[PDB]
Amino acid sequence: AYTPQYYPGSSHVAVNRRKHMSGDVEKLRTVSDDDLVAALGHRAPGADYPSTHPPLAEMGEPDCPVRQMVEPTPGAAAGDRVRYSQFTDSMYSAPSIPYFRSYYAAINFRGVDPGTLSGRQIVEARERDMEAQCKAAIESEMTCPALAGLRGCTVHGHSLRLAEDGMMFDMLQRTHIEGGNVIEDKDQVGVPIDRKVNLGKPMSDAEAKKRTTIYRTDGVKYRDEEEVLDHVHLVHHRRTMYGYRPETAAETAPGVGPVTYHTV
Amino acid sequence: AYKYPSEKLFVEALKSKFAGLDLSDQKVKYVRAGYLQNARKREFQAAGERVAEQRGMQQYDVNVHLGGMTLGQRQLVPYKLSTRPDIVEGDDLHYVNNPAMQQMWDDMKRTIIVGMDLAHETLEKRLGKEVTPESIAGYMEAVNHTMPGAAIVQEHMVETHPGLVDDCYVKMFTGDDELADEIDSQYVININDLFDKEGQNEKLKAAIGKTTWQAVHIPTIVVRCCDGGNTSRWSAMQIGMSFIAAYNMCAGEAAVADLAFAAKHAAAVQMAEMLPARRARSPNEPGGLSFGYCADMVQTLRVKPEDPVWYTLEVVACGTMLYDQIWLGSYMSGGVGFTQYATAAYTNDVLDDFTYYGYDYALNKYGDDGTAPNDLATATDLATEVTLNGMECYEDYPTLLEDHFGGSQRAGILAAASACTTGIATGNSQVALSAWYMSMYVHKEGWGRLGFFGYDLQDQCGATNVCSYQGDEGCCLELRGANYPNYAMNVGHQGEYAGFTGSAHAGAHDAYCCNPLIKVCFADPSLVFDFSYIRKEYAKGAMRTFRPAGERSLVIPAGV
Amino acid sequence: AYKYPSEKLFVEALKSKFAGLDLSDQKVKYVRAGYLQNARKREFQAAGERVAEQRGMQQYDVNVHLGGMTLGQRQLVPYKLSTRPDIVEGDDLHYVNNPAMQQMWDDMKRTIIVGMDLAHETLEKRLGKEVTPESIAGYMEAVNHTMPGAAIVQEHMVETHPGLVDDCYVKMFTGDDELADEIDSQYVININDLFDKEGQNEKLKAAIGKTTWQAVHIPTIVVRCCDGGNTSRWSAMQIGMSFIAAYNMCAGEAAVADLAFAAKHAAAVQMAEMLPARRARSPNEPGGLSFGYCADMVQTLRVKPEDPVWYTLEVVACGTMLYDQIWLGSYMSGGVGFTQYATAAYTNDVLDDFTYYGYDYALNKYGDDGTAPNDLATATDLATEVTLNGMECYEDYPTLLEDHFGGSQRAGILAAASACTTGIATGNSQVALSAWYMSMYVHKEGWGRLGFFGYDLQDQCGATNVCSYQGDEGCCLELRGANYPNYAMNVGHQGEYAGFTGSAHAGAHDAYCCNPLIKVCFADPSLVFDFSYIRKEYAKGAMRTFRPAGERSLVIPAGV
Amino acid sequence: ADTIDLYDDRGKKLKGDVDLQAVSPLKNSAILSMVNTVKRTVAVNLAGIEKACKNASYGGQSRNIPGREVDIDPTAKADKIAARVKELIQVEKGDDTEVTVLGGGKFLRVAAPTRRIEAGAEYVAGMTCTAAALTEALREEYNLGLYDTPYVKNAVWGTYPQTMDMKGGNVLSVLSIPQNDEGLGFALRNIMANHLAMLSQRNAMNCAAISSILEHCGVFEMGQAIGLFERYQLLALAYQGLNANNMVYEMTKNNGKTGTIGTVVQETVGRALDDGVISVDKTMPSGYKVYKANDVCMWNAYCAAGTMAATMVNCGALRGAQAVSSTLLYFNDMIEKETSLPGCDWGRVEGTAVGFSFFSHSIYGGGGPGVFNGNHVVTRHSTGMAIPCVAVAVALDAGTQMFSPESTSAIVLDTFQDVPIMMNPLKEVAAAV
């Protein structure tokens, strides 16, 4: 079968990007089921999953050939509500960047609705499926609990100076450091919870730069990653050419000029 | 030629916001002061207390913000108007709070340009009247009495209060210097005096020819009570009354209807046409405003064409405010709206730094204004260099990144600097448009983010639709506008497109971009807003020093 | 029952305008005083002198009137607001000069009604939230902070000045008395308190049922800078922000889009829909306003339903000013406009005399309100008698004919009196419509004239289109409006149609004509304009004693 | 010339080696019939007319005109009314006029004679002649007179002509009024996704076909399938909407148990490479391979089929419509990253999806997927390669939506459930070749 290559580039940042896309992300910490459910804020830990419609087996389905060959996720079969996890990630070398969180979701999980924005990245899915996807992300090297956190609202912070203790600014201060560990004591929409969810130690600055997918001047400078720039240019050029005419001849139409690439 | 200096242009504003700050520091102490840190928020809270007490119903209250926190858990930072000394609180740039911004749009909306040649031909053909400088002069006196809402034919007419309509007037303009010199100068836009640099006056007169036009500006209060669709109709009614009186016509004969059709339709040049049903709007509203017309309304180009960047960035300031803050942020949505989506393009000298850097790069690599190759390779080079340099600025100066805290702001500013550099360098708006989309693609891969959820709808459609020639895709940038299908929804683009449309013609050393009638009309100093220096006007509005038209103080009570 | 008195109702105004005059005189001495006779014209001339000096360009000057004559070669006569002691100069009734009139329209354009049931069902179904009086109360506080333009979710937001948006608010209303009683009264329109006559409250609650609605009124300043299309969008943005906060939603999840579609479309009740291309307009503009909705906005019916004529003529005053002075006389034309075309219907107690005469005739011949036969024979009898009586009044009182100096004014007032008499007597709007056209045809043959050149386009199409059932002809009067094809152009009709649509429901002793939601919304005393006594408000505006919303004094300079 | 194998909704081959031109909107008799059917067929809500008259609720939106109730019962007389409507609209005995009573009398399906469309300039003659015939039939049946017929007329026609549309009325088309067109040639693009799901009876393969056909008919009417662009559009129609070569069906089957958006990306690239549509162009120092398209329009068609299969796999797994916006975005973003070739519609599917995601997850407008259509400002931008995926996602949803097919489009289901072109579009298109 076809072997994916995912993304160009040769720096360790490009290597990290391919790790996130391929799902080959190291597990770094453990978050209990009850702690994660409390943080997400959609139901009480241990409570039954609420439903938005009856289980498929109980209500039946239309005679659709696609339904009959596409297996529903566990949460879809059960009729769970569609709920969400949402993360914000610092531009000061957080492990994750928004688009690559969405690629991780889209490549590696079934029945997911990821969304990418500058200051927030969301995964919507049937509740129990969403929980499993969030657990994978939050336990992995995609997360530093100082540089990233669950924020379902009031997300400001990705682009701000870090606090003196290295925590990304949160207007609602849903997390804080206690004894070297990041503690979350509000749910993702700012409601106090009756527990202290221990997300463990923040990454060192050096570890963050080894694990990050972002290019910036204090790490891997974007200007030096000529393979990614070539890729961007190739895609823009071919889009421009084929919007004019969808044929090979458009690639040398008048107006293209002496286009040139670094590595190809 | 221009030489980019050793200190970034945005450093002054950073130092003025953060006295004593080490601009390399990536960390800061958060004090979580809340709203009490800020004089404007405190003034708003007190205003909300009075509102609630006077009407018996809760209104503004900072404590209603969710999460038990008020605005200002971080520092609330003010904004320097770019190229100005004025630093203002952010709320002072909200369109609702800023009369300069309101009056800029009202001045556009209340304007219509109406040809006189067809009307004169009608008088000659149907009535056998001779049109002379003397008859035109009598007409210009008549139309400046009637246009604000006063009577010239009937008995027992009631009229508008002249003080409520003091901003309404009509001037004529023409490429015929002999006619222009015969009419009293109070009634004429003097093309030669206003367009005295780089032979711009001769370019405009050659383009307009020996044709005669009226620049009509109906009262601000009228468009405020009503809409932009009032403008061409109001204009035509009083043009018609004035022709009736000035040419001794029957006050309502068949020939009058030819004058009406001419003034309403055949010789009328709207600022904007109507919009489709989902966003139904009358003519002369922002969604119908083309980028070429927007660029031509701004007048910095007649003051200092030797600095193409300045005019370019005044167009950006004009367009980003109008299109993002008033049009998208109000007409098409509302609420708190979209102030900072637009301020990023006209404050803190940020876009200026990134654009002058690019201008210097292009001058050194490709040569003089407007001489760079008009091709995709050149757009690629300029966009990539300008975008990489800007991203490096945001990375090296933490408080710069914190200013443009939303990715959408960063995307529009990096892409505007890229496309304005390309426009000035190549003199070609369409090539600049390729550079705009290239900036976005470069940006996305560097940081793994771009703008808001729906920022790059036009972005991802963008490269392939620059050079399409299909019916609803192909269009030169000058004729695109806020109703071009891909552009019809989203912040952070429309005013920047007007800006680099201006940049291409500034780089070519043209006198205008799209319509010489628009260019002359908006050069007139008798307008309320000063179209020659947009950001200076915005500062006045933010400082409560801009006097708008349309207020009703003459006809309302006051008292304790 | 009502008894028509021995002295005509218009005589007082004649005697107050002309102290000492023999009202039978057919002749008068003309002194040809010109504008100097009139304090308002002299003030305007002085205002025009200041305007010209301040801007360096001629503006208003009475001597520009053609013929070498200024206004006032005859006597310039003032106007008494009907049912009011206030006598005002005619210019004080021009919409541009009258803030009460402007604010009436702004209060309508800035209003949208939005259901809450679908939003609550979305929260239950998609999120599993429970909706309770406590959660609704939290939502009502949130929406009254956010609606005027203030922030509830994000950090570093800039906001509108609360003082500039003090007229903006949201109240809920419901036919469920138990829910209404549980919410703080500051947030609730109390149907039982406002509709306490003739069981109107019970009729409204039965029609609305146990459904919940928000009456949203966005800031006047916003619709003044923009248009009526802004209203439903602004409302929906801040409704959305308030649900996000009040129900702890993701601030931007799929369920939020369902709330948006509900607030913008599915549960949104606009005041008016869009118009076709030739007269392209956004929603919430006057051309789209149905006559039933216009009548339901007027609130005299809840104050004194035992006098159906009063409410009827307040509706006439509302509609004639809005449709003729603002809509036809500005949006669709402009200039001096159409003040006196409309004042004829709301001044000098003329229409009141003609209509109370008809009411007395119908009560004595056919019996109680609403009980007359719903047929063409009855419309014929009532229209002919009322029209002949009114014509005789104009013939017997020369200064009454001088007041309604234009045939169009006479036509609209005779036909309004005829149709309002028919509406009250029969309780049927469509039968009243036949009576309106009958009056026109009777009038035309008596005097050999009717209205202006184009007055009876709808008139002559009229009788045959009352009972047509063809696609673009058939329509009940309540659902007709200013876009019904025959009605789309001409003064002297639209507001009168709204009036007798109200007259039919007043005669039937109904609580509303067309939409109970509109009825409840506009009964709220928290609106700026008093919808319960239209002519009293117009008098305040004409006397410079009406305080409107939307002024910018807080953010503009003053100085010498 | 290009040929395709046509396959049905269950993955079975219908016809081999069919000329691409034989599935053109300009040539295929089944497509031409589908367009004629949607233009001339209207649904009549007799129950709605009855309720409006009995409750004086003319125009909807909580309107009530006290005292103006008209007590008529057309649902009880539906057969008589239907026969009168037929006699009033039919041009010649035996013509293609049809009037059928549905729902026990609650509704009529009216297929106005094609000749009435041919004699006019647009498609509205079905709506107007049906509304007129109904108004007359009710006037006759119920002995209505001068002053009450106007109210009944508003029960049928809504607030027309105060409004441009029959707002609050009881005559329904799957099309809208022409004045709602965003631009030139958009009338067949203005078909709500919820309606398309009901036309298809929630058969997602048939939904893809119906929606793709109508979208491309619109693109042809827009003038955007001329010259080389005709092949570009026809290949997208065939591969994305008509299950050409069984690719959509087989990719969905292959990824239906455990697959994701990303695995569908991978299979699409592998198929393009194995089939010779793309080839390795150059290799970067890291070993990343830049590809080249050997047949540009074919590469687009493969990306369009993949976008569809990815929707079927991801929304099918969720049994939820909302994931269609992210599927269209991320399928195309990641196939570009995987290949350095441009994605479906050269970015216009991705771009449509960016704004569609935003306007299906924000405060500002839009809604759930079911409210979108090819004429919607948000979703108009691709030439027919996005909306069919939206309609499929709407069909696959198991009950997560507030504005669902059953809540907005119930009468469309009843009107078209027995209409052969909508019951088996792929079989009818193949049989017409």
Ligand code: F43
């Ligand atoms: C509720 C939404 C979803 C939606 O449809 N609109 C919102 C909210 C809306 C509200 C917020 C007002 C308030 O706080 O009550 C307003 C002002 C529009 C309005 N209704 O008046 C707005 N956004 Ni938003 N919105 C903005 C932005 C943004 C940035 C902010 C990221 C950050 O790091 O702070 C992100 C998108 C992104 O990540 O790219 C964003 C999201 C969001 N935006 C999330 C809420 C995010 C949160 O929970 O904190 N906006 C910006 O990026 C800058 C301009 C800013 C707008 C106000 C202005 O222009 O002054 C405001 C524009």
Ligand code: F43
């Ligand atoms: C020039 C027209 C043709 C036309 O298209 N509109 C005119 C003029 C226009 C102007 C007059 C302004 C001015 O004096 O400078 C305005 C005010 C509209 C505007 N442009 O602002 C107007 N008429 Ni006219 N116009 C009126 C009327 C009338 C009556 C006046 C008859 C009389 O005996 O005085 C007649 C029509 C008729 O005979 O029925 C009439 C005609 C006419 N009307 C004849 C000019 C008549 C003349 O030579 O004196 N109007 C009226 O009948 C009452 C309302 C009055 C309107 C102003 C207001 O409502 O206050 C004004 C409405």
Ligand SMILES: C[C@@H](OP(=O)(O)O)[C@H](NC(=O)CCCCCCS)C(=O)O
């Ligand atoms: C999409 C459409 O909304 P609807 O889907 O029709 O409700 C459209 N709004 C917009 O485009 C909102 C634009 C401004 C707010 C978002 C700026 S990014 C409008 O109201 O006509």
Ligand SMILES: O=S(=O)(O)CCS
């Ligand atoms: O969060 S969203 O991108 O939907 C809106 C930004 S204002």
Ligand SMILES: O=S(=O)(O)CCS
């Ligand atoms: O004289 S006309 O009837 O044309 C216009 C009257 S305002």
Ligand SMILES: [Cl-]
């Ligand atoms: Cl090719």
Ligand SMILES: [Cl-]
């Ligand atoms: Cl700190």
Ligand SMILES: [Cl-]
């Ligand atoms: Cl005399």
Ligand SMILES: [Cl-]
């Ligand atoms: Cl070709």
Ligand SMILES: [K+]
């Ligand atoms: K306005």
Ligand code: NA
């Ligand atoms: Na005053």
Ligand code: NA
């Ligand atoms: Na002040």
